[PDB]
Symmetry: D2
Subunit: 296 residues, 4 copies
């Protein structure tokens, strides 16, 4: 199978005066490249995918694919939707503009059955030719891709090669790899990056790497080479920042953190997202003080 693994970053989408700051976007990707990141995920959850127009969705993917040309960094484009026809179109668009693969979240809100999830992802997988990574985050979608469903899709479709797990349930990660040791399980879940890798996971799609890409990258490569004491030591150091980045819903804390670090000039969200509370603002800024945040 064609795969996309390693240390990956769920890119934030910087806004300025209500529009996407395109040049800030390219420089944030270049910082990630220069800090050992293996792949970037434009216009996903952390990139505020729900509040983007369809042209800003297209434009941000194009910037990522053009900034990653001439490097080892792959572009894993966000292309999920709770309507199968739309997710097929988003998949076809990501492939036609040079993405290396697609991330595709489980359909949200409309709560399809396990049968529906199978026909959903199979319809995406058989219409386009690029690697497809499933994304399970039941706290946001209202549904779960069962272990049985993930494994059937992995065996039935050649483009489906793994799953990003944001369940908070390492029992499910044991279940998956014990029955299907050939799939690429990706951590979607920063605080427990090391335990997922130590059980055979092959990468992370992390929010923290927006702020500390060099540490997330080192954590990942230590683990993939089975340097488990070094990878765990980094996972332990990152715990405080890994947790505070969800004091409110992601990407509210991480974007506040990038702004406090001076990596974005403006702290803008699109409604219904907004800036955090004054107390949570102080909590993020105080956790930040004990870490070293690398510049451009």
């Amino acid at each position: 199978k064609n795969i996309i693994i390693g240390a990956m970053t769920a890119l934030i989408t910087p806004f300025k005066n209500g529009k996407v700051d395109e040049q800030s976007y390219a420089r944030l990707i270049k910082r990630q490249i220069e800090n050992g990141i293996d792949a970037v995920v434009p216009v996903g959850t952390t990139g505020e995918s729900a509040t983007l127009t369809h042209e800003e969705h297209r434009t941000c993917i194009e910037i990522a694919v053009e900034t990653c040309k001439g490097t080892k960094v792959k572009v894993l484009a966000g292309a999920g939707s709770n309507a199968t026809h739309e997710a097929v179109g988003l998949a076809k668009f990501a492939k036609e503009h040079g993405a290396d693969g697609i991330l595709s979240v489980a359909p949200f809100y409309n709560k399809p059955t396990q049968q529906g999830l199978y026909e959903h992802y199979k319809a995406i997988a058989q219409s386009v030719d690029i690697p497809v990574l499933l994304y399970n985050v039941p706290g946001r979608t209202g549904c779960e891709i069962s272990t049985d469903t993930i494994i059937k899709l992995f065996r039935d479709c050649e483009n489906i090669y793994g799953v990003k797990e944001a369940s908070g349930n390492i029992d499910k990660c044991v279940d998956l790899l014990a029955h299907e040791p050939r799939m690429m399980l990706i951590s979607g879940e920063d605080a427990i990056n090391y335990p997922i890798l130590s059980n055979g996971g092959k990468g992370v799609i992390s929010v923290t790497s927006n702020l500390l890409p060099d540490m997330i990258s080192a954590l990942t490569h230590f683990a993939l080479d089975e340097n488990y004491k070094e990878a765990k030591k980094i996972n332990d150091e990152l715990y405080n920042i890994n947790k505070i980045l969800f004091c409110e819903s992601n990407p509210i804390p991480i974007k506040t953190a990038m702004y406090l670090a001076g990596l974005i000039e403006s702290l803008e969200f699109r409604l219904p997202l907004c800036s955090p509370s004054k107390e949570n603002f102080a909590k993020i800024e105080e956790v930040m003080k004990k870490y070293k945040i690398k510049g451009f």
Copy 2:
């Protein structure tokens, strides 16, 4: 405030060969009218709002609004979205086609804070002029509109007049009405329709009424005139079907029931929604048999 209360129906959307069967849609709405329903909700969750194109949204509201003219039956159009800019446009779009009010679900997937939720709904409420009904269904959205947020929204904008509560938490309904007895709390969970009405709720938005409109209508009107023992007896009779209509995710069971009763000519969903389980199919057909289902 202008209000939309009483017995209301969350309309299913009949498909025929993958497109919307318009004639049948008009014929199902008049069936609801002739059976004592006070208002209809086109293209909401039960109407498969996520898998409809933007024209299907339009024509379904237009047919509903037109079939209802010359009756007292109001059209409360679904117009929610998890992007505030989009939800404002859909609200403007619903008034522009003759809706009496709008239902607007809490943003899903992107998990906004209470501050963001307030500014989301305040933006919708102040951009257009028809009654606005909040909809809280945390099992589907990943977020919950707090009682204080609901009450603040109700008191600050003239448009917002109540909430459809589908949390399954009667404590929350006591909380709302004990602190703000002027809002219209609308039931969003059929099994507990009577207990919500007996605590001061002023209507239901029902899935069961697609199948049994006369019984949901009678339940609601008995309760509003405080004939509690009749409202309770009908609520008790409906319990078995109220549960079975959610053996799988709505609107899968209810549409299967409409098809078995010969009220729609084809049992078509749009992916990721699909036909029900085989065992659940039998469960629907067997409890369906214990009630009387009126024809056209």
Copy 3:
């Protein structure tokens, strides 16, 4: 056509003094309940800190109750549950020997029996004594739940089992219960939702709030049973703020704090692992208490 114990009931607190049961304060708190329209008292239940009581203190509190209530219309529904079936049978026979009118028996906690085991647990209790038995379902504390089907089978198969106290926070289960078995006595176990459970056919409450405001809980219950539903809802709404604040921390920590603030008990003592609340919740409890009128002795 079974024997029932219904109406407005109070889950009594157990006042401590220097680690000992203040027997006389216990007798005088029961008299306050009697004089304020309460239909029954539940000694040595959850609110009475049954887990930290000695076995002798268990009895004396039932004996104090049975005897203070003699010469009144107030019944004694004794706490007698256990997560060991052999023990709960003895506790049932025991409450019968000391004059109890019926027993409350919590679902087995910690050891999570299956529905089959729950059925055999309660069938053993019910067939051991000829006294009314009220099931108590509180999954947040026990880790298990008595399903609707199990409760109905126990109600139909045992003559002593006559209902359930529900502290599920799930009005759907109460609809389910009474729609399929309208003859059972469903008792509310959550004060904030006392009125909605009565309005669906519930026949009583076992209340924490009536320790503090017995006249209002009793009036709430009696209005509802007489189908004066708007008056019952009006009191339920007034009680909401105090009904919620009484669980800012684990019951009986808030209510015992309130009783001390109202001068109804003379010391604010718990038995470990229970202790007094945080200072922030203490202030919130004491500030909500100030908007209600609290009866003395």
Copy 4:
């Protein structure tokens, strides 16, 4: 600090004619000893502690203490209770009768606060001068010992040396060991034994080792010597049996498995525990057939 770590077994209590089969009890401990087990936990949750009299509690601890005399196996006696006065007595009893340490479950049913939990365990720790291992199992107790409480107890009491975690929340174990890396975290969930050990855990208290002691024993020792490829393979092989052992509440499945393997002579529980359903009986028996179960 004095510690008790490694591969440990939560002993079942075999009954014969409603009575404790003492000679069977001694021999089940000898089997564990002969199969590489580092410690035994008599009269815990798996030992049906709730339904044992206070004399059967003693006798089983004395049998454990006497069967392990002259071996490297330590006795971690069960001594928890939801009344602080009783748990102090149970602790005092285990020490006077030669236990190496005590397991002490968080108070159940009465839902103490974190303040109360600290005062409960500090009273126990100051009661006896033997190691005390906390036990956090919120699904059974109704409360959880927070990370902050565990750490305060670990630093304030010299006898408290770690925690057995059965929350199913690998995030909490990262939290514990990242802030207090000197504590002994013991796994209380068999399916995720390897991930807890690979993150710095120092042992397991297992239900599965009753049936397959050599395999759990090997898993723990592979992990403690950091042969993670070997530990993970055994953990993955154990996944099916680890799950079926909880198809119904523990210890119903495990005692059923011990009886099917001819290791106990009668399938007796004390009510409210009872024999499993006929279908789970068949499922337990099916799974069993794919492993090898060592005899006496």
